């Protein structure tokens, strides 16, 4: 909101805020509805305190109460405080929009692909004696882009369907969440330029990424305590 840095001109350049998932972390094996409701009410309080200042886009996460399959549907129309009824009337979705786990945000004519990161964690959990670092993760992202698919490990990532994961148009910017390391790289495959950004988790090393659409540049802001 510009309250901390006080640079109104610089802060106002942030048109939209995109939450990539993992808003609430819980163990589904032993969890009650009361604690999840408390966490969701806290998240709704934050959203109501930040929605007037900036638009917020909510994306499903791996540990969030959403479908375990990779094509996760949006969170719900429910699970939020009663103060969000105006935002959830249905007509006003431009400032608070919930999308599926894989989506193509056409932000100001720039199409970007964002996922929760379950696929990368799925290949990471496998041990391949033929090939967990930032460079290794970036090489994995490069291989994923080159193979023209989003989830190379189909059984681990998705379960059946009701194939969307087969790419039909290359996005300008690749966004993957829930990664221990942050890295950015510009690539050139087949004469096309694709940017890959791996935003890190906010619970540990809570740094965020500011992606400038004009110059295709990403800068990191670190928050300590």
């Amino acid at each position: 909101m510009g309250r901390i840095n006080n640079k109104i001109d610089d802060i106002s350049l942030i048109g939209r805020l995109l939450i990539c998932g993992n808003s609430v972390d819980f163990d589904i094996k032993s969890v009650n509805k009361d604690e999840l409701m408390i966490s969701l009410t806290e998240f709704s309080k934050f959203l109501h305190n930040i929605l007037p200042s900036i638009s917020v886009d909510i994306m499903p996460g791996t540990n969030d109460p959403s479908d375990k399959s990779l094509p996760q549907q949006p969170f719900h129309k429910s699970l939020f405080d009663k103060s969000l009824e105006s935002y959830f009337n249905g007509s006003n979705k431009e400032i608070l929009n919930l999308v599926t786990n894989p989506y193509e945000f056409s932000y100001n004519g720039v199409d970007v692909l964002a996922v929760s990161g379950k696929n990368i964690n799925d290949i990471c959990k496998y041990v391949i004696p033929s090939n967990d670092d930032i460079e290794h993760r970036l090489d994995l992202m490069e291989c994923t882009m080159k193979w023209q698919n989003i989830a190379p490990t189909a059984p681990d990532t998705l379960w059946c369907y009701p194939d969307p994961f087969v790419l039909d148009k290359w996005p300008h910017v690749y966004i993957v969440a829930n990664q221990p390391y942050f890295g950015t790289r510009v690539v050139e495959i087949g004469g096309k330029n694709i940017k890959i950004i791996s935003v890190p988790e906010f619970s540990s090393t809570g740094m965020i990424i500011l992606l400038d659409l004009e110059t295709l540049e990403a800068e990191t802001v670190k928050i300590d305590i």
Binding site: N32, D34, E35, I38
Partner: protein
């Protein structure tokens, strides 16, 4: 009588957990900062993870709430493990409690948060307490009730409620005011210290709070329990 009891139980649980954590009655490693303890706690009150301790605290809170009509003062007594001397007394004064059988959750939880914050502010300023050299007790002050005399009829239990009632009736013993305090030896007699703290003043719940501290002695009192100077 439905929502009031829940809020009172939550407040008592947070009070007991904070008192145990900040006075080093139990190791801080066992205590964990958490918000959910099957109830919506007002703040991040540290709750111990010991199942036996959790059950004991819950049973104590339930027993206190069961006789809250005849109880006008609830206190937590801190006594040294070595010698039976009360070195710290924390009192939750229930002056009126507005007992009505006929306020929302935000205001009550705000008052509870303010009370717990004042208690924490009082507790941090206190000196550190050595490990495995302190114990806590529960002493309540009543107006009109007799405990332990309900087993004179040889009653046979048939339901869980009556068994719990007969257990709670005989779980208290009669004591006297100013019993565990030093007996005023006269050689630099101890002078207890009184500190006043703000209490919750919601419409259904009116609560006053204060604490007692020895802050004195005549040798053999507060010895090796305050971690020397600091």
């Amino acid at each position: 009588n439905r929502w009031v009891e829940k809020w009172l139980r939550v407040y008592l649980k947070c009070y007991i957990n904070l008192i145990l954590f900040y006075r080093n009655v139990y190791p801080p490693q066992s205590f964990d900062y958490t918000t959910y303890q099957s109830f919506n706690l007002p703040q991040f009150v540290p709750i111990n993870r010991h199942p036996a301790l959790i059950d004991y605290i819950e049973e104590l809170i339930l027993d206190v709430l069961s006789k809250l009509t005849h109880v006008y003062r609830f206190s937590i007594c801190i006594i040294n493990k070595k010698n039976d001397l009360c070195i710290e007394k924390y009192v939750l004064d229930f002056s009126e409690l507005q007992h009505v059988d006929k306020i929302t959750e935000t205001e009550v939880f705000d008052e509870f948060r303010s009370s717990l914050n004042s208690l924490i502010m009082h507790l941090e300023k206190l000196p550190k307490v050595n490990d495995d050299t302190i114990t806590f007790e529960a002493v309540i002050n009543a107006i009109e009730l007799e405990l332990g005399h309900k087993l004179d009829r040889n009653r046979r239990v048939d339901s869980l409620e009556e068994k719990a009632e007969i257990e709670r009736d005989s779980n208290w013993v009669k004591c006297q005011e100013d019993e565990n305090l030093p007996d005023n030896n006269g050689f630099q007699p101890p002078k207890i210290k009184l500190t006043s703290l703000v209490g919750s003043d919601v419409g259904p719940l009116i609560i006053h709070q204060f604490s007692e501290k020895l802050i004195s002695g005549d040798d053999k009192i507060l010895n090796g329990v305050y971690s020397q100077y600091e």
